[PDB]
Amino acid sequence: MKFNVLSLFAPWAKMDERNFKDQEKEDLVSITAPKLDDGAREFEVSSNEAASPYNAAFQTIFGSYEPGMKTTRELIDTYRNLMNNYEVDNAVSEIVSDAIVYEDDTEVVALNLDKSKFSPKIKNMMLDEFSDVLNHLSFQRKGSDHFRRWYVDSRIFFHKIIDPKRPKEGIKELRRLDPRQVQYVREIITETEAGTKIVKGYKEYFIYDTAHESYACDGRMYEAGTKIKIPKAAVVYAHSGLVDCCGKNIIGYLHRAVKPANQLKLLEDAVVIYRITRAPDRRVWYVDTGNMPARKAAEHMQHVMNTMKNRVVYDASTGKIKNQQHNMSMTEDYWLQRRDGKAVTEVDTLPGADNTGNMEDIRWFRQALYMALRVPLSRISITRDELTFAKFIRELQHKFEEVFLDPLKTNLLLKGIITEDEWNDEINNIKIEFHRDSYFAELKEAEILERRINMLTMAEPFIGKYISHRTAMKDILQMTDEEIEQEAKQIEEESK
Amino acid sequence: MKFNVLSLFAPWAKMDERNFKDQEKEDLVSITAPKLDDGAREFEVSSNEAASPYNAAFQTIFGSYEPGMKTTRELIDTYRNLMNNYEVDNAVSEIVSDAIVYEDDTEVVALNLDKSKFSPKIKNMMLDEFSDVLNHLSFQRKGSDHFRRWYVDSRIFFHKIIDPKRPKEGIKELRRLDPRQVQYVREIITETEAGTKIVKGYKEYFIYDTAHESYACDGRMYEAGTKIKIPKAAVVYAHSGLVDCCGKNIIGYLHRAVKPANQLKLLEDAVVIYRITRAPDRRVWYVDTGNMPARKAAEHMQHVMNTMKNRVVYDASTGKIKNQQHNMSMTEDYWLQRRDGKAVTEVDTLPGADNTGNMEDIRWFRQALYMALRVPLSRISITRDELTFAKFIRELQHKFEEVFLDPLKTNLLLKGIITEDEWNDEINNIKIEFHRDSYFAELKEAEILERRINMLTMAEPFIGKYISHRTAMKDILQMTDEEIEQEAKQIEEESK
Amino acid sequence: GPAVMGMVRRAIPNLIAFDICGVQPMNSPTGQVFALRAVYGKDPVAAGAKEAFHPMYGPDAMFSGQGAAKKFPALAASTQTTVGDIYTHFFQETGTVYLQASVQVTIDAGATDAAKLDAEIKKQMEAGALVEIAEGMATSIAELQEGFNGSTDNPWNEMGFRIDKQVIEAKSRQLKAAYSIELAQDLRAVHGMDADAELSGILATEIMLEINREVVDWINYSAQVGKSGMTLTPGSKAGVFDFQDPIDIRGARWAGESFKALLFQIDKEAVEIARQTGRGEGNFIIASRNVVNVLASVDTGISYAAQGLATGFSTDTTKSVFAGVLGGKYRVYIDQYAKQDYFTVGYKGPNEMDAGIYYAPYVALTPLRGSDPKNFQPVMGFKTRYGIGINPFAESAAQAPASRIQSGMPSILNSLGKNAYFRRVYVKGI
Amino acid sequence: LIAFDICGVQPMNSPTGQVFALRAVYGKDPVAAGAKEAFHPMYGPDAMFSGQGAAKKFPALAASTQTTVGDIYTHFFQETGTVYLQASVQVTIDAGATDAAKLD
Amino acid sequence: RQTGRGEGNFIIASRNVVNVLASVDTGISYAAQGLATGFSTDTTKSVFAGVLGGKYRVYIDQYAKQDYFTVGYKGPNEMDAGIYYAPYVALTPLRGSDPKNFQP
C-alpha cells in the first residue's frame, strides 16, 4: 500500500500485501516462465516495478482489454446466446441436476473432515463455518443457480466482506459479481540481465470498469463505472481450466457446442423458410398494354388487377378462408382479354412449396450437437457413458468446490481457529462431498452385489477344495480382512 | 569453457559439468551415428572444445532454429485447433482419463518399489520424494491436464528449482513451461579423417525461446523473449516416440487425425452450405427498360422492383414473418406491364436448397476420424480391441511416467540418498503404478474366473482319474505353487 | 512473392530507468517537499543568518564561547595583524575560521575578490602566520550574563531553525501517429503487420526514451565540475582527465599501472561528493562506452598492476546499459549517447528523498484512439505527465533560499553546474 | 573453410529475391529531406520532440550567431546528432566556420 | 555503436596476429606472454583458433595478403549479419556424355 487507495478494501489489501511479502521472502526463484499455470492474464513490470500507483494498473488493463478481455466479454455473451436456445439449455439442466443433488430428509453438499486434524473442536468450528458459507449463499435453495452460472459462463465470482470495525468476525454474505465487468491480472514484478527468472508475488488483483452508456443489451441502468482496483483476497472464484491456443482468454466446455449449436439453428430456420415459402398460390400476370403513358396504362392494369385478384386470406386463428362463403367452389373461373394479335398476355404460375425431403441432415447435426453439449448418448442399467459423466461431474464439483474452500479458510483464518500453515498441510484433505442420487446409487450397488453373489454361487462347490471362503470374500465379494472378521462376528451374534 | 548465464543456473551447470566429465572419460566411443534415437538435433563444431560463452552458441542454433520451433508451433497450434473440435476432444478426454484416473478416498499414480534397498528407510525416502513430486505437479488434482498436453502437444517440459545457496533444501515445485517454447540440440565435439566416430559426448543441452513478437493474438504483449541456452539438468521433459520420415521431426499422437479432422469439418460445412444457399425461394425479375436513357431506365427498374420485390423476412428469434398481416395469404399476386405484346420481360425462378442427401460421406469420415484419433470401436470386459486399447494406455503411461522419475532421481541425488550408479542399477525396475477403474477391473476379473469355474466343473469327473487337484489348481485356476499351498492351509483352518 | 528475404528494423536501446534518482510516485500533480535548516543569530530568517550545520563549512567554534563576549577583527585585504590577537574570516569554502596571529603581517593588499583574499589567507595559514583557534568565554563574564549585578549588553547567543519549502509542477508530452488505412492494409499483406500496434510501440518508446534521456541530461546539467577546487591537481588541465599527460597519471606508462589513475580520481570525486552533500560517498557512475571499456579491462581491485580484455563489466549498449558494479562499490551505467567522452559520478541514498535529482510520475503513457470522418483515417497517440525536481540544499553554497519559498524544479539559476550530489569529468586520450 | 559461419543465408526460392526494411520516422513525413529516423543507432533521440518541440521553435546554432543568456538553440552533430543547448553564457560561434565539421 | 544489436563477437586475423593472441594472456594480469599455446594456429586442422578471452570467436585469415585483422558482429538472427549467402541453386552435379565419341 503506497497510497490508501479504495480504503474500503484495506483489509483485503492487507491480506494480499502480506502474502506478496511472504512470497518475496521465500526463494520462489529460478523460474524461466512466469509461475502461472492457469487463471488470470499475465503482464510484465520493471525491476523494482516502477509501475504504480493504480494509474499504471490502468495501463495494464487497457492493453489487456482493448485487444483482450473485450473478446472475453463477447464469449460470455455468446454462452448466453447459446443457452438461450433449446436443445442446449436442457443439456445444462441435466449437468446441473447431476452436479448437485437435492433430496428430501438428507444433506446437501457438506464438509467432511474424516482425516486427521488437531481436534474435534476445530473440526466442529470448520463444519460450522462451512455451513455459514452455504447459508450466506442460500446454497441449499440457490446452489443450482450458482453452479449453473459457473458452468455456463465458465466462471463464478463473489465479493467477500470485512466489517471492518471488528474485522475478526468480519465475513458476512458474499456477493456475486456481474459478468463481464471485471478483469483479473498477475504482473511479473522483476527484471534482470534480459529475462528474469526470479520471484514476484504477481499482484493477483482485478479491475471493474463497465458502463450502461454502451449496451450489450438494453434495459440496464447500473454498472461498474470507472476503473476500480481491488486486491485478489477480496474475492472467491473458480473457472474451468479451458483456454484458447494462447493467452488466458477463458472459455467453457460449452464452447465446443457453439459451432453445431448455430449450424443446427441455421439449418432449422432454413428448413422452415424452405417449406413456408411458396405454400400459398403464386402467379404473375403479364399484360400487353403498350403505347400509353403510365398515367393512362394504369387504368388497364387496374382493370385486370382488381378483377383477377383473389382478395382473400387464410384465417390462421380459426381455420377458415375470409369471406369465402360457401366454403369452397368446385372451380375458380378467371378471364383475360388480349389486345395484340398473338397470345402473349398470360399468367404464369410459380412452382410451389413441394416436399423434397429426405429431411435427414438436420437430424445428424442435432445429434452431433446434443453430444457436443457434454451429454451421455443414452439420452435424447449402468454403462460407460454414465460412468464417464459421473467422472465429468466429480471433476466439475472438485473444481467448483473452491467456492466453499476459499471463504472457509478465509473466515477460519480471519477469526483465528487455524493458521495458514495448518491449512496448507491439512489439505490434502478438507474435502467437501456432494450428495449422490440415492436411487441410482442403490441400483448401481445392487448390480455390483448381484454379480458378486453370482460369482460366489459359482465358486460355492469348490470352496472346500480350491478356493478358501476367506479368499472368496477377498476376491469375489471384494472384502477387506477387517470386513471379513466383522461379518463373522456379527453372524455369531445373529446366531444367538 | 565458462559459465556465462544467470547464476540461478549455476547448480544445474555444475550437474552438467559432472555429467560431461563422465562423457569425457566415457568409453562409449567409436560410434558412427550420433548416439541418440530421438529428441535433440545434431550440430558440428569449430574445435575439439566447442568453446562458447553461452552466446556464440547461437550462431549454429539460429541456423537450425529457423523455422525451428515455428514448425513445432505449426504442429501444436494445429493439434490444439484439432482438439478444440467436438468429437476430437472426447478422444483425447477418454485416452487421457484412462491413463490418469481419479477415485474417491484412495491414491493416484504411485511409485511401486520391490527391489532391495540398504534399508526400508531408503525405500520410504524414495516414496516420500515421489509424493512431493506429485504435490509439486499437483498431480492429484491436475495430473490429467499435464498428460493431456504431453499426449496432444506431443511433449511436455518443466523447469526444476534450486535454492541455490542451500541447494539441498531448495527443491520446489516445477513450473510447466508452455509448449512450443523449446528445442533440444547435440554437438559433435571431435574430428578425424572426414567424419569421426570417437569421443563425441555431445552434452545434449537445450534451448528455450518465446518469440511473442509474432501476431499477438488477444493482447500477447509479453512472454519470455529471446533464446537462451539451458544446462539440461534443469529440465524435466518427455515426448512421444513419434516422428516424420527423418531428422528429429517430432509429432503428436493426434497427428494422424489432422487430415480427416479438417476434411471432415470442411465437408460438414459443405453440407450446411449446400442446404442454406438457395434455402428461400429464388427468382430474377427481368425488366424491359427500353426506349429510355440509362440514367432514367434505372427508375423503371427501381419502380418495378419496389412494387414486385418480395420484401418479406423470417424472424429467427420468434418463428414469424415480419409485417405480413393477415396471418397467411391465399396467394402471392404480382402484375407486370409489358411495353407491347412482346415477351421481353419475364420471371425466372431458380433451384432451391433441395434435400439431396443421402448424407453418407459425412458418416464415413466421422467414423474414420474416430479411428484416426485412436478411439476404440465401441465408442462414439476384455475383448481384443478393449485389450489393445488398454495396452496403448499403459504404454502411453509408461512413457509419460518419466516425468516423475527425472525429478525423483534429482532430489535423491541432491539429498545424498542415492548415487547415480545406484539409480541406474535399480532401474531396471522402480516403475510407477497407475490406478485403474475398479468398476471395470472387477468385471474383468470376473471374466476368466467364470470360465475357470466352468472348466473345473466340466473337468470334475476326471479329478479322481486323470487330473490331480494340484493340476486342477495350476492348470485350470491358474494358481501358482505358493498360492496352492496357501489356499490348502487356509482351508484346513477354515474346516473348523 | 518473388523470394521474399525477410525484413529488418532497428532494435530499441535500453534505459537506465531511475536507478540513480528519486522516483516519487505521485497520486496528484504539483507535490511539495519542505526542510528544516538549523540556524543561529536570533533570527532564523534573515540576511546573514548562519546555519548550524553544513557539509562544506566549519562551525563557529567560538559562538557559544568567547565570541559571545567580543567581536573579533576580521581579516581583510591590506590590513596588518597583531601578534597574539585573533582574527575572523569566513571562507568561500571551509566556512568560519578563527585565526590567531603568530606574526604582525599584512595580507595581500592587492587582493580584490574574496577568492584572492582566501588564497592569501590560506598561504598565511600554511606559512604558520595564521593558526586555527577557539576558546570558551571567561567565566567572570558568563557570571553576569542577562544583566546581573548591574551589568548590561550581555545576552547569551541564541539558536533556532527556519522551515521553508519548495514545490514542483508536472510538464507533459504527447505524440500521435496520424497513419493511413491503405498503408496498414498493405503492411498486413507484406509482413502481416497490424501497423497500428507497431506505431503504438514506436510512440510509447520514443516518449520513454526521451524522458530517460532528459533525466540523464539533467544530471549532466546540474552536476558540478570535478578535477577542480578541492579535487584539483594544481598542474592539471582543470576538469579533464588525460592519458597522454603524466600529470594525471603520476608519470605512468604501461597501461597495467596507468589506467588505475582514473579509478583513483573517481574515488576522489565520489568522496568530495559526500563532502558536498553530507550523506555518503557517491555510489554510481555513468560514463561513455570508451570509459567503461577501460574500466572493464583494468583490475580495479588493489594490486601491483594488471591489464587484460574488457570483460570486467558488460560493455554493450545492446542488451543493457548497466555495466555492473565498480569494485563492488559503484553502479556503472553507460552513456550510450555521450556527446564526447567523459563520466558523471554521484550519490543516491536508500531514502527516496535523498537523491539530488528527482523524477515524480503522475500520468503515463495514456493511449488515445479515434478517426477523422472527413476521410475516416485513424488517429492514435499517447500522453505522459510527470515533473522533475531538485533537492533543497542541492546548491549547498547558500545556506538558505530567498523568500522561504522556491520552485523545486531545475533552472539555470537554481542548479546549472551546482548540484552537490554529482560531479562531471571530461575524458580524453583513451 | 568457414564460409558460412558468420553470414546470414536466407536462401531464395527464385533468383533475385527481395528484402524489406522498416525505418521508424519522425517529423510528419515518412519520406522527406530532413526526415529523421527515430531509432537510428548513431544519433540520440530528440528529447524535446514530444515536449517543448511542439511548444516553440528552437532556431539552430550557426556560424557567426550569438546566444542570449537563458535561451535555447539547436543543432545536429554529424556524429551523435541532435542536441539542444541552453545559453548559460552569451557567446558567439566562429563566424569563419562553414562546414559542419568546423561548426560541430 | 553502429548496429545497436551487439558488440563484435568474432575476430578474423592473419596467422601472425593469431600467433600473438595465442601467446598473450587475455585475462587481467600483471604481464603475460609465453609460447603460443592457446588458440591453435595450425590452419592444417582448422580456421577457428579459439574464443578470445572467452568473448570473441577467433578465426585465421590464412590468405591475408599482408598482415591485418578485422573484427565483426554476427547476431542470433540470419538477418543480423549484414552479409548474406543465398544458395538458390547449389552444388548441383552435371552428368552426361558427348555421344559422338561417348566420352562422359
Side-chain angles (χ1 to χ4, degrees), chain A residues 370-384:
Chain A
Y370 182 69
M371 291 171 65
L373 295 167
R374 314 299 298 147
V375 300
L377 276 64
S378 68
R379 296 186 58 76
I380 296 169
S381 184
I382 306 298
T383 189
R384 186 174 293 278

mmCIF file of all heavy atoms in Angstrom, chain A residues 370-384:
data_model
loop_
_atom_site.group_PDB
_atom_site.id
_atom_site.type_symbol
_atom_site.label_atom_id
_atom_site.label_comp_id
_atom_site.label_asym_id
_atom_site.label_seq_id
_atom_site.Cartn_x
_atom_site.Cartn_y
_atom_site.Cartn_z
ATOM 1 N N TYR A 370 -26.197 -32.398 -29.682
ATOM 2 C CA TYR A 370 -26.562 -32.833 -28.377
ATOM 3 C C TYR A 370 -25.311 -33.383 -27.739
ATOM 4 O O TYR A 370 -24.882 -32.915 -26.695
ATOM 5 C CB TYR A 370 -27.752 -33.792 -28.445
ATOM 6 C CG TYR A 370 -28.245 -34.280 -27.103
ATOM 7 C CD1 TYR A 370 -28.887 -33.385 -26.234
ATOM 8 C CD2 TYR A 370 -28.112 -35.603 -26.746
ATOM 9 C CE1 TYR A 370 -29.357 -33.827 -25.006
ATOM 10 C CE2 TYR A 370 -28.586 -36.039 -25.520
ATOM 11 C CZ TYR A 370 -29.201 -35.159 -24.650
ATOM 12 O OH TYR A 370 -29.647 -35.627 -23.428
ATOM 13 N N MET A 371 -24.597 -34.246 -28.448
ATOM 14 C CA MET A 371 -23.375 -34.793 -27.899
ATOM 15 C C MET A 371 -22.385 -33.691 -27.471
ATOM 16 O O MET A 371 -21.806 -33.755 -26.368
ATOM 17 C CB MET A 371 -22.725 -35.665 -28.950
ATOM 18 C CG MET A 371 -23.425 -36.922 -29.279
ATOM 19 S SD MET A 371 -22.692 -37.745 -30.713
ATOM 20 C CE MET A 371 -21.039 -38.205 -30.172
ATOM 21 N N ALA A 372 -22.251 -32.642 -28.311
ATOM 22 C CA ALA A 372 -21.337 -31.502 -28.131
ATOM 23 C C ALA A 372 -21.570 -30.740 -26.863
ATOM 24 O O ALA A 372 -20.672 -30.077 -26.343
ATOM 25 C CB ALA A 372 -21.419 -30.545 -29.299
ATOM 26 N N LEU A 373 -22.755 -30.852 -26.337
ATOM 27 C CA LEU A 373 -23.132 -30.169 -25.132
ATOM 28 C C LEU A 373 -22.680 -30.884 -23.879
ATOM 29 O O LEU A 373 -22.967 -30.425 -22.775
ATOM 30 C CB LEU A 373 -24.619 -30.004 -25.149
ATOM 31 C CG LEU A 373 -25.134 -29.117 -26.252
ATOM 32 C CD1 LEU A 373 -26.554 -29.290 -26.337
ATOM 33 C CD2 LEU A 373 -24.856 -27.649 -25.929
ATOM 34 N N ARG A 374 -21.896 -31.951 -24.049
ATOM 35 C CA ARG A 374 -21.359 -32.745 -22.960
ATOM 36 C C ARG A 374 -22.452 -33.540 -22.296
ATOM 37 O O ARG A 374 -22.726 -33.383 -21.108
ATOM 38 C CB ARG A 374 -20.679 -31.877 -21.891
ATOM 39 C CG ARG A 374 -19.714 -30.768 -22.371
ATOM 40 C CD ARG A 374 -18.586 -31.293 -23.113
ATOM 41 N NE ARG A 374 -17.799 -32.177 -22.274
ATOM 42 C CZ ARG A 374 -17.128 -33.259 -22.695
ATOM 43 N NH1 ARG A 374 -17.146 -33.589 -23.968
ATOM 44 N NH2 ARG A 374 -16.461 -33.987 -21.820
ATOM 45 N N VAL A 375 -23.078 -34.402 -23.083
ATOM 46 C CA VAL A 375 -24.150 -35.248 -22.563
ATOM 47 C C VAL A 375 -23.885 -36.714 -22.888
ATOM 48 O O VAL A 375 -23.059 -36.992 -23.753
ATOM 49 C CB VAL A 375 -25.457 -34.820 -23.237
ATOM 50 C CG1 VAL A 375 -25.756 -33.376 -22.933
ATOM 51 C CG2 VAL A 375 -25.306 -35.032 -24.672
ATOM 52 N N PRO A 376 -24.494 -37.662 -22.163
ATOM 53 C CA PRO A 376 -24.468 -39.088 -22.430
ATOM 54 C C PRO A 376 -25.263 -39.394 -23.687
ATOM 55 O O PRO A 376 -26.263 -38.738 -23.969
ATOM 56 C CB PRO A 376 -25.078 -39.669 -21.154
ATOM 57 C CG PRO A 376 -25.926 -38.564 -20.590
ATOM 58 C CD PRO A 376 -25.193 -37.300 -20.913
ATOM 59 N N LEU A 377 -24.916 -40.468 -24.389
ATOM 60 C CA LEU A 377 -25.617 -40.797 -25.632
ATOM 61 C C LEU A 377 -26.798 -41.695 -25.376
ATOM 62 O O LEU A 377 -27.504 -42.124 -26.288
ATOM 63 C CB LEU A 377 -24.668 -41.455 -26.628
ATOM 64 C CG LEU A 377 -23.805 -40.498 -27.503
ATOM 65 C CD1 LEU A 377 -22.822 -39.683 -26.612
ATOM 66 C CD2 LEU A 377 -23.047 -41.325 -28.506
ATOM 67 N N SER A 378 -27.011 -41.959 -24.105
ATOM 68 C CA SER A 378 -28.099 -42.754 -23.598
ATOM 69 C C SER A 378 -29.376 -41.927 -23.618
ATOM 70 O O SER A 378 -30.472 -42.449 -23.407
ATOM 71 C CB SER A 378 -27.781 -43.189 -22.176
ATOM 72 O OG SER A 378 -27.789 -42.082 -21.304
ATOM 73 N N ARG A 379 -29.241 -40.623 -23.874
ATOM 74 C CA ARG A 379 -30.374 -39.733 -23.861
ATOM 75 C C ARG A 379 -30.697 -39.081 -25.188
ATOM 76 O O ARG A 379 -29.852 -38.916 -26.063
ATOM 77 C CB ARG A 379 -30.138 -38.652 -22.859
ATOM 78 C CG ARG A 379 -30.033 -39.142 -21.477
ATOM 79 C CD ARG A 379 -29.949 -38.032 -20.514
ATOM 80 N NE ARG A 379 -31.106 -37.174 -20.644
ATOM 81 C CZ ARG A 379 -32.327 -37.463 -20.185
ATOM 82 N NH1 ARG A 379 -32.590 -38.598 -19.606
ATOM 83 N NH2 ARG A 379 -33.315 -36.629 -20.327
ATOM 84 N N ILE A 380 -31.948 -38.676 -25.322
ATOM 85 C CA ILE A 380 -32.399 -37.943 -26.489
ATOM 86 C C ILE A 380 -32.201 -36.451 -26.301
ATOM 87 O O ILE A 380 -32.843 -35.845 -25.446
ATOM 88 C CB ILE A 380 -33.870 -38.283 -26.776
ATOM 89 C CG1 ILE A 380 -33.952 -39.794 -27.127
ATOM 90 C CG2 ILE A 380 -34.459 -37.375 -27.888
ATOM 91 C CD1 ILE A 380 -35.346 -40.373 -27.180
ATOM 92 N N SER A 381 -29.734 -49.441 -16.901
ATOM 93 C CA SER A 381 -28.644 -50.085 -16.173
ATOM 94 C C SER A 381 -27.456 -49.160 -16.027
ATOM 95 O O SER A 381 -27.608 -47.937 -15.990
ATOM 96 C CB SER A 381 -28.215 -51.344 -16.885
ATOM 97 O OG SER A 381 -27.240 -52.018 -16.149
ATOM 98 N N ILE A 382 -26.268 -49.734 -15.945
ATOM 99 C CA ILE A 382 -25.062 -48.946 -15.797
ATOM 100 C C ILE A 382 -24.202 -49.087 -17.029
ATOM 101 O O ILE A 382 -23.833 -50.193 -17.419
ATOM 102 C CB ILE A 382 -24.252 -49.413 -14.568
ATOM 103 C CG1 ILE A 382 -25.149 -49.416 -13.274
ATOM 104 C CG2 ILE A 382 -22.977 -48.538 -14.378
ATOM 105 C CD1 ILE A 382 -25.732 -48.084 -12.831
ATOM 106 N N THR A 383 -23.849 -47.971 -17.633
ATOM 107 C CA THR A 383 -22.985 -48.043 -18.797
ATOM 108 C C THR A 383 -21.811 -47.114 -18.723
ATOM 109 O O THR A 383 -21.701 -46.282 -17.819
ATOM 110 C CB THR A 383 -23.721 -47.806 -20.110
ATOM 111 O OG1 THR A 383 -22.810 -48.121 -21.179
ATOM 112 C CG2 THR A 383 -24.207 -46.370 -20.217
ATOM 113 N N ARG A 384 -20.952 -47.229 -19.721
ATOM 114 C CA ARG A 384 -19.745 -46.433 -19.768
ATOM 115 C C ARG A 384 -20.004 -44.951 -19.800
ATOM 116 O O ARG A 384 -19.278 -44.196 -19.155
ATOM 117 C CB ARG A 384 -18.860 -46.839 -20.922
ATOM 118 C CG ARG A 384 -17.519 -46.123 -20.928
ATOM 119 C CD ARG A 384 -16.618 -46.627 -21.976
ATOM 120 N NE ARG A 384 -16.203 -48.016 -21.730
ATOM 121 C CZ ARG A 384 -15.203 -48.401 -20.894
ATOM 122 N NH1 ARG A 384 -14.520 -47.511 -20.200
ATOM 123 N NH2 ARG A 384 -14.896 -49.680 -20.785
#
